[PDB]
Symmetry: C3
């Protein structure tokens, strides 16, 4: 037998504290599967946590019921989910392909979207958008939202813009008007 993978099924009864269908399954070459029913399905994938699933080549899923559902996807946290080339960090964090979701219950539903913060959310129809902050939600594609229906946030420590597509600060607004 050619040993290239690491498969570690339960080896202890938590009611006794002694280490010696809950088998872990490392099916890919060089893969790693650790924990009750944990499964690393393809090449070099890593799955650590009860019921964790790393379905993609080189995918990484850590946390109970965490699932990396595509190649290279990475998930960290209980019930976190990430599609191909995505990143989902935090319990219940979820991201569509090539997206980034960081925070408890964060959701990057649009492909390539970014959702940072608890319950931050980029709706599936808001392409290439970003939601930043607790409960921040996008309302359109090609945008960055720093708030939601019941909260608008001020943006601080902004240096005056110079190029046409640079943001403008209060001092700048006043100055330009004065002159």
């Amino acid at each position: 037998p050619n040993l290239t993978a690491v498969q570690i099924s339960p080896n202890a009864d938590p009611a006794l504290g002694l280490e010696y269908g809950l088998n872990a399954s490392a099916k890919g070459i060089h893969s790693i599967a650790i924990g009750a029913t944990a499964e690393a399905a393809k090449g070099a994938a890593v799955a650590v946590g009860a019921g964790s699933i790393a379905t993609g080549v080189n995918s990484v899923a850590i946390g109970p019921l965490s699932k990396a559902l595509g190649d290279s996807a990475v998930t960290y946290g209980a019930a976190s989910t990430a599609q191909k080339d995505g990143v989902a960090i935090g319990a219940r964090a979820s991201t569509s392909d090539t997206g980034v979701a960081v925070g408890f219950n964060s959701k990057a539903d649009a492909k390539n979207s970014v959702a940072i913060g608890h319950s931050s959310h980029v709706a599936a129809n808001h392409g290439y958008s970003i939601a930043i902050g607790d409960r921040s939600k996008t309302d359109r594609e090609n945008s960055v939202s720093i708030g939601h229906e019941s909260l608008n946030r001020q943006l601080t420590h902004l240096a005056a813009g110079t190029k046409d597509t640079d943001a403008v600060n209060v001092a700048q607004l006043k100055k330009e008007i004065e002159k």
Copy 2:
């Protein structure tokens, strides 16, 4: 004995390179504890790293002295800390309940706050705020800070705002004034 957990105490002397009160402790059903004195205290929790601690149900703590102190909390990095439903990524990263801290020494002190970047910091009294960037610090609640006492940053690649609560760029400021 019903084996549902994975408990892996030290199995090698780094001075010899041979693998065979530093015992790891997987106390929860389906939990995983790997490393010198590592402890996963509750159901399905995961603790990997010397002195790592996952105290909450479904919590995940990886890194030496990393500690997930509440249910569903996730921590990654040396001495990283996260309260319930929080996310702390990076050495010394710390977050209060339901917050997000990413970066070395990042601190999301206010509940539900977000701190991204080295030494980024949302003070405990700045509710629902966000700090973005190296050393960025918030100065008030309900805000997003992209700088600190000795640094204001310009915001670039901003498309002209349309709705009342959209940001304004330089070209837009000039245009509106001209007319």
Copy 3:
């Protein structure tokens, strides 16, 4: 022999599903190395994944070919790389010293920079800058970019600025002009 580290070399043939120069190497006291050729080189470092490398004291590297190249660095994902005190999350994510890179192929090339989003990029000469969003790229130091050469994004849910260095929204621009 004084057992303080965890070293787990391949223990299964994925073609058989049975768990019993690909040896793992836990060289540091309290270190953890799991997976084919995985190596945790210094004190308390953690390396999980085929070919993973944690070279720094207290560093953490998880994912195939993932490498934490400096003290306290943390990396998560296939081929992710992070220098000292850095954070790199996502396959191919890369960060220079004390930086943060989150997202597939994200690159925080400037020290202390932050790159969040798929292929987000802060060039090495753009000190202390941040790039937010899919393909967002900075074009200067001390800045925050929310777009790139072929995409400018609108910023939404912005509350009117009050301090001189606060951002201005559309309603505010109109109001000030009117008066």
